Amino acid sequence: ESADLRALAKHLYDSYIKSFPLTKAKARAILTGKKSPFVIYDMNSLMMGEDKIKFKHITKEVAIRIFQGCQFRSVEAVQEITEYAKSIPGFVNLDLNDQVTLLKYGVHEIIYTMLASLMNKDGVLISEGQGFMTREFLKSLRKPFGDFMEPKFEFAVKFNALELDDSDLAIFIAVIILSGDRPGLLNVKPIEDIQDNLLQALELQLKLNHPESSQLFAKLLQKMTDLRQIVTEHVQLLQVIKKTETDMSLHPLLQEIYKD
Amino acid sequence: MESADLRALAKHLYDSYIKSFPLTKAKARAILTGKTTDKSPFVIYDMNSLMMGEDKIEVAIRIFQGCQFRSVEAVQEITEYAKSIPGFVNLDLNDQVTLLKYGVHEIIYTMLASLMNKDGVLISEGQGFMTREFLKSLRKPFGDFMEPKFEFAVKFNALELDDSDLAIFIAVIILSGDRPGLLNVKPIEDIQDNLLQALELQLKLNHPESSQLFAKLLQKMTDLRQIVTEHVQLLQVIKKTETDMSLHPLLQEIYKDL
């Protein structure tokens, strides 16, 4: 069934390109200077970026504005991921509650995984690659906002040293979604059955796409440990931001859209 | 590596695991499932039978200090095992220490699962058996100390690993190049690369019907990392509430800065 695993890999890659506008291939071409993006490195260039990079989220404090900007984009990504999951063979046949449970607990790990595609050591692409926020500008943010963003850079630097491309990541993402260990799942067996195929598919993909990179399969799986740990730490930052930043108050309809 | 070389590394590690850990999973299962009239444990399920166990083999504190002493013993055995992992003792000293500092706990809960079923845990080299319910009913935060380890053990034991498997898995845990503060990640990763290859072949040969067991076993490393985190936070809570309590220097040092 080797031919079958190559086929599943091809299916997921095609769906991945369609579901996610800014591919890792495209983002790397932009970061490496290969139509140049707008750069945000201080407060003034941010003010000129809102009226130039036309962020879809301007509705008075700067660090809050950035954090909520990250929140809005993440809510957009949850919809893109939801559309991608539907293409995973077997996903839409699962019990409806279980699909909702797999997406509820998986989007956070997928977002961080995919955010690494947009980062280098020096910053992160934004607005489908038209803007660029420097690591230094993010690390220097006041309050606990400065420490929210630096962990994602540290993880992305380690993670990106694996040198995965989009065809690799498309299967990795599918594998995260089909985690049979999410709390409250009603029928674990078909989820773990699908994950086995995706796991076979990822293993073959990495041997063929990285024949020199020994044990790349194992090493990528160990990155799920790091992902789970950073999602957990991130949650505890939200609780602190909710309970300390009353300036982080929103319009009730807005609070409601962004509560997840 | 060549298959014959990986089999040789697997055999070396199994051999050293038998030498370093006196109570193997094989022995613990023979005691837990029994039929054996020579290996039968005394069962501790309440306060009185605990008192009768003292004459055969605050209450919640005594138990906690019991786990602490056994934990130090486990660290000693794990440290003796690590020394046998080819390449380990040639590494920079600080990294040897760093690998053990972050590795021993994940290995302790791994091997603790061998001593557990759904109903309790072997103790005192298999001569006793403390029920899960009795531990869950301990007062203050102590009742919540041991139950996460049970939840992991039930799932982990469903993998049906034996000792030859665990020996290689334990080795892979120690040689993690992602531990905070490592100075020379490359030589650690080259060793883990060999150990990961050895584990792959071993699980394929010993569990050929167990699809993707290699992948499933590695994902269990996620669950280990989370239970270590919870344990540490409980220790900080007990430290600030029981000032009469005290820790072993080996344990003291493992918990400083995660």
Ligand SMILES: O=C(O)c1ccc(-c2nn(C(=O)c3c(Cl)cccc3C(F)(F)F)c3ccc(Cl)cc23)c(CNc2ccccc2)c1
């Ligand atoms: O394109 C994406 O998929 C994408 C996804 C996440 C982020 C981003 N999210 N984020 C969070 O805190 C966060 C995460 Cl990880 C997960 C869930 C909720 C949150 C929440 F709610 F808190 F925001 C960051 C913290 C630090 C950094 Cl450097 C980036 C992030 C970004 C960065 N911005 C962006 C804006 C426009 C266009 C492209 C990019 C992009």
